[PDB]
């Protein structure tokens, strides 16, 4: 039909052929990972009870509530179909026995710089891999695929995870229309958002500190150092603090860096940032870019 309709049917055909299917995602998983890898796993469990389907990898603790993962022998990979989602690079795949199956399938929305797999479906126009999986489902409908409540919730969590609940510019028509269909399943989006957005008191306090102390140059320049005492004063990791860099986004008139000792993260509202050089788009403090 649509060169696309053909590609998706080929993945569906291949999935129907193999009795054992093992699914992976990228290390340091995020909602999209859990949405796609596990969204598909759930679709295949419901559609094909007679097969042996497994999702492998190391759990992220804040994401567990979504789904729990399987631990699998080396022997189970023999003759198995392996599907890997949301991972641009083979060296970032979680659980490296990914190419020891009979076949390997790449499903991804990042650029195809590492074109791995026997079968590949890689669209950079998708908002997320979870969205790609809903699409794959739609085509699988004709072929007897079933979406249950669990799977709906997974895919929906992955789409809101990669778009910042329809905030970022990777949101498309398809993203929103698909979201529409998903929320007709009876999972609580409210419970879901509460779980996704839940933040430990100590991190909140930290954010606070940051907000209280941010300063702005007349050219919209802003900077945040989270020195030594600070990370201990608040009892927060490097990982927890660095992850607050995107909380300054709405300050009126901001055009900032971020930082943090273990690290540099940078963000803009205009002036590209793939510039400031120190091997997406206080010496570094040449930032006031904002000048021009
Ligand atoms: Mn991801
Ligand atoms: Mn993704």
Numbering used by the authors: -6 to -1, 1 to 249, 251 to 257, 262 to 275, 278 to 280, 284 to 285, 299 to 302, 304 to 306, ...
Question: How does the study describe this entry?
Answer:
We show here that Bacillus NrnA is a bidirectional nuclease that can degrade RNA fragments from either the 3′ or the 5′ end. We have determined crystal structures of B. subtilis NrnA in its apo form, as well as complexed with substrates.
In the crystals of NrnA H103A soaked with both MnCl2 and pAp, electron density corresponding to the full pAp ligand is not seen, presumably because the mutant still retains some residual activity. Instead, additional tetrahedral electron density outside M2 is clearly visible in all four chains when 2Fo-Fc and Fo-Fc electron density maps are contoured at 1.75 σ and 3.50 σ respectively. A difference map contoured at 5.0 σ revealed the presence of an ordered water molecule between M1 and M2 that provides additional oxygen ligands to the metal ions and may be activated for nucleophilic attack of the incoming substrate. H104, the second histidine in the signature DHH motif, does not coordinate with M2 and is therefore accessible for interaction with the substrate’s phosphodiester backbone. We can take the product phosphate seen at the active site in our H103A:Mn:pAp structure, the 3′ nucleotide from the H103A:pAp structure, and the planar density outside F162 observed in the H103A:pAA*A to build a composite model of the pApA dinucleotide in the B. subtilis NrnA active site.
